Design a protein around this ligand. Structure first.
Ligand SMILES: Nc1ncnc2c1ncn2[C@@H]1O[C@H](COP(=O)(O)OP(=O)(O)O)[C@@H](O)[C@H]1O
Ligand SMILES: Nc1ncnc2c1ncn2[C@@H]1O[C@H](COP(=O)(O)OP(=O)(O)O)[C@@H](O)[C@H]1O
Ligand SMILES: Nc1ncnc2c1ncn2[C@@H]1O[C@H](COP(=O)(O)OP(=O)(O)O)[C@@H](O)[C@H]1O
Ligand SMILES: [Mg+2]
Ligand SMILES: [Mg+2]
Ligand SMILES: [Mg+2]
Lengths: 107, 370, 65, 370, 370
């Protein structure tokens, strides 16, 4: 689906919270981790522009910065059976993640 | 009315075109909590922007979304811009065309992304990306001169003559205030002072701004500091501890003229300015020599202009008249120029509009903007 | 005047006083004082009093050191 | 009042018939900005002419619309003529007959297009194209003599006796001031002074004008320069750098008498004048020998008149009295002659009128002008 | 036998007259440690020459003693020559006549210093300074043709016909590989890649030598690169980082044909060759058009000869047959010609001998050699 997509290695390491903050009684694990993965999925500038625009639409839809959008997507996926497009988008993004060159660190 | 946002590495200077000063000047930082818990209702806010991050500094890790004039964290840069529009200027960006700035010889994706965000995220009616040295020359009133712009991320000089830039003479050094801040906390360890956190880096930046100065002759100043205590100054840390620094006061800014202090092979800012001038046509050099204009926070050291006057005078032929222009508003010259530029009636046709962006996309920025 | 251009530009008088007989006397006829036996005064471009190290427009584009 | 415009390859001498000197003298150059942008407020005019081009040469590419006496860019030439009338003389060309000049043996199309442009785009009531050597003889107050006219573009000899020209004896030599400027550039590199751009060609031309001189005895000056530094003179460039020039001072003008210096297979100006005289009738040669008139800027080298006497005397029979006439104002002698010519009442019927141009078209210039 | 030392701006090509290729080819660089200390007993030296300087490039500052064909550091040049004779050729210079080379239109002090050092420092029995383009024609085996030699420092044209050079038609542009390397360094910043040190300049030179190529149609290639990634190639840096380069591959060498890219007001190499031919006699231009011979490393770009064929063909009249001769060994053609020249029996009396030198001094070189 995406050929020629490259990522800046270690770009996400700055985004990882301290372990002590992870224990905070109001720590948003889902949003913070999705933020880390979103940063890791930032296309490197060396990626061809048509691919960059193409993928940035995919990760922006699946991993939006905005909390309102992230909460909107969270509800729509609760009944994902009626969203074949999201199924396809999410499947495409899962395939990108599993081929990410730094998947081991992300895991 | 048009918004002017000088998005520097260290500070955000933002405001409305036509005003004499920016309305909102706050650190270009996003801070996130690095400690734990532990009280109900006291942690729902993740991330802090600008002044609020600087005040809660002690419990946060601070990160600059811009390093060396380059946006490295676009998610945090959106937060910085959202804070600027909605919380500091209190404006709806979709009603205001926005002029913003960048250093010359930046990566081209840097302009494209900042155009993308302005049109697609903030829905701005129009935008423009100007060069900071050109804006500084606007602020100086001149149309000729070689600007030396040095802020937090990068120092560059742009020679301009009769309004014509000589791009082959643009110089860049990735050596600016933040490198000087880092060097100072390195040499502060010589006196047993250890600053390691991002918060402590901010306080060391504060020490630099208050106590550091450029020595007119570095060797004599070293001899003076070594032979006496006359150059020592004390500084009170936020917890009441008092640190005293002697020759570190001028050894830190000396890195600008001797970049080998931090291991850099590059030439000093004086030699870089001279090299930029010599790269220009022999006819325009005399005017450039007389119109060296400083801008940015990193040119606010006491004695920087006098040192530059001396250093460039030693490199130029003796018959030239070297003049350094260091306005007291140096730190905002870039924003001032952008405020001037955006309000000129002859500039209203140079905006990138939402319609041109739709037709062409982010690459429209390379065609419409220097 | 032509003979001195030959000495200047073509080394006609390279051999100094060792110039062969007929050429020497022809030169003596044109130049009676014999000063031609001392070859042309050639300039040297080393250690010139005031010529050092000028940087023009194109030179300024390279400027090592 | 008639307008007298001596459009030479190097300079535009323009003014009013009857005056002692041209009102306006400026370079015959059109400059265009070769650099980028970047400031909006200055207006950024797209082209510059004359003194304005010369002062801004640092950021322009300088173009001469006349090459070796021939107009090679008619658009730029029309710019130079519009500048002459409206900006320099501030006259309405519709009200003044215009006397132009050109070198002999020029292409005939050059004459016709000058006529066409003057009548059609400038709507002069009348005009006339004169020969620069003839005008120089007018300015010398003589009716007999051989004029050696040497400006920026071409050197030409015209022998005249009692007002009659011998056109078969006219000599033309495209070796002139501009070729000497280019040669000085070449030999200035021998000392490490490399001038390349057109703006720097103007600097080299300035060096030539005030440091070059003609040597009476070339070998003697070469020996003097080799054995001493007494002939070395310094020159300060616009940026303050000082160049020191030795035998190049007299080697550059020496090309006029040894065109093989620049690879030209032609005789020097001395032998060309002598060859012109010898092509004339034997009964007028004595009067031509005593009436050698120098004209034009390229005859302004110190020592050139004395060198021409020595050279022409060495060629002519010993009983001939050789006299070189070199007035101090020989640089403007051509314009002076045109001023005299256009003033004469008896010349007032020689004008090509607009009516004659209409009936005949531009070809009328060949019939009515030498 | 005789030594042949083709020391250009970038590389030293050295060897023995009569051999088919230089024995010693190494960079013309002197490196000095820019870092500190710190281990005693290490085989540390205060300077490194050539291949060893490249190896330890990481901790050195690299300096070229020759720039734009001119030796600017005579102390570092003497150790470059000491390295050549003793460490690379393993010869005693005291018993070998040595043939040296330089570009045309160099400062005359350059040849004299070369002669002085060879006779006084290295005590060579005889030596000769030849012109690189003439040696290139020797290597091609022709006696007619216009040579375009382009190394690291200078590009020059020398038209020769039947062994006769037309020195008034020699062109020289101080625009060669080193200028192209610096331009590639500049335009690599558009993609975020920063190279500022001399060591990284060497890396960029490596990128240029193996990824850059000349576009046949520059606008077509620009459109191709803008619409697709088929022109993007990758390069692995010494530390393992991989940089992707697109239209910079052909924009870098486009500076040869469009010198305005780097701010030079100059004609491209295609126009300079055509201008050189036109300065030659009309009767030899046809043979020059068919004998354009390229030499030097900067002519090793893929597609440059085809681009020259297209560009000169567009400037010349349609009936002429343009032929570009680009031998695969055109990088060493200059040294090859020197090897041929120095081995001719007919050349052995053209050497400047030690007795000649000590009777005349350094200026002998101007009389004996070109
Ligand atoms: N009075 C001062 N003396 C010395 N340095 C200063 C002073 N004020 C600001 N600076 C330095 O200038 C930098 C900010 O300058 P600025 O022009 O705002 O840069 P930017 O445009 O990148 O935000 C800071 O890193 C700071 O250390
Ligand atoms: N004092 C001087 N000494 C030497 N050369 C001069 C002097 N004044 C002018 N020139 C030369 O004469 C040329 C201009 O002469 P001019 O008679 O104006 O020619 P044109 O008729 O083509 O304008 C210039 O190229 C300049 O180099
Ligand atoms: N294959 C290649 N492609 C492009 N450029 C090259 C290639 N090989 C060498 N060069 C360039 O040629 C220059 C060296 O050429 P050379 O003829 O050795 O110059 P010099 O005579 O000054 O040593 C270097 O600056 C290098 O960048
Ligand atoms: Mg700034
Ligand atoms: Mg004239
Ligand atoms: Mg070479």
């Amino acid at each position: 689906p995406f050929s020629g997509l490259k990522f800046k290695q270690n770009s996400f390491l700055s985004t990882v919270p301290s372990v002590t903050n992870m224990h905070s009684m109001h720590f948003d694990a889902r949003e913070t981790f999705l933020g880390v993965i979103r940063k890791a999925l930032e296309p490197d500038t060396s990626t061809p522009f048509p691919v960059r625009r193409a993928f940035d639409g995919l990760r922006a839809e699946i991993l939006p910065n905005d909390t309102i959008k992230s909460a909107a997507l969270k509800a729509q996926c609760s009944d994902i059976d009626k969203h074949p497009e999201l199924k396809a988008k999410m499947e495409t993004l899962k395939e990108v993640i599993t081929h990410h060159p730094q998947k081991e660190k992300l895991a | 009315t048009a918004l002017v946002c000088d998005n520097g590495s260290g500070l955000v200077k933002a405001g409305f075109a036509g005003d004499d000063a920016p309305r909102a000047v706050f650190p270009s930082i996003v801070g996130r909590p690095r400690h734990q818990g532990v009280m109900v209702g006291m942690g729902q806010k993740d991330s802090y922007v600008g002044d609020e991050a600087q005040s809660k500094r002690g419990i946060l890790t601070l990160k600059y979304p811009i390093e060396h004039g380059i946006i490295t964290n676009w998610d945090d840069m959106e937060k910085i811009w959202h804070h600027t529009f909605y919380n500091e200027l209190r404006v709806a960006p979709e009603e205001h065309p926005t002029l913003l700035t960048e250093a010359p010889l930046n990566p081209k994706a840097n302009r494209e992304k900042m155009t993308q965000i302005m049109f697609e995220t903030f829905n701005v009616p129009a935008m423009y990306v100007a060069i900071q040295a050109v804006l500084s020359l606007y602020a100086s009133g001149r149309t000729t001169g070689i600007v030396l712009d040095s802020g937090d991320g990068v120092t560059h000089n742009v020679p301009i003559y009769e309004g014509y830039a000589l791009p082959h003479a643009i110089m860049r050094l990735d050596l600016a205030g933040r490198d000087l801040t880092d060097y100072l906390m390195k040499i502060l360890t010589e006196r047993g002072y250890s600053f390691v956190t991002t918060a402590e880096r901010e306080i060391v930046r504060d020490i630099k701004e208050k106590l550091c100065y450029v020595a007119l002759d570095f060797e004599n100043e070293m001899a003076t500091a070594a032979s006496s205590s006359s150059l020592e100054k004390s500084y009170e840390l936020p917890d009441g501890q008092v640190i005293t620094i002697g020759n570190e006061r001028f050894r830190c800014p000396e890195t600008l003229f001797q970049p080998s202090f931090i291991g850099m092979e590059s030439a000093g800012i004086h030699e870089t300015t001279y090299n930029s001038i010599m790269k220009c046509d022999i006819d325009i050099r005399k005017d450039l020599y007389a119109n060296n204009v400083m801008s940015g926070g990193t040119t606010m050291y006491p004695g920087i202009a006098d040192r530059m006057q001396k250093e460039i005078t030693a490199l130029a032929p003796s018959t030239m008249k070297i003049k350094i222009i260091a306005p007291p508003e140096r730190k905002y010259s870039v924003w001032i120029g952008g405020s001037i530029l955006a309000s000129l009636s002859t500039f209203q046709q140079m905006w990138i509009t939402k319609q041109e962006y739709d037709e062409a996309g982010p690459s429209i920025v390379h065609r419409k903007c220097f | 005047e032509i003979a001195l251009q030959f000495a200047r530009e073509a080394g006609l008088t390279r051999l100094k006083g060792e110039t062969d007989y007929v050429l020497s006397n022809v030169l003596d006829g044109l130049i009676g004082d014999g000063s031609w036996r001392a070859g042309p005064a050639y300039e040297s471009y080393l250690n010139k009093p005031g010529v050092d190290r000028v940087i023009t427009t194109v030179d300024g584009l390279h400027m090592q050191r």
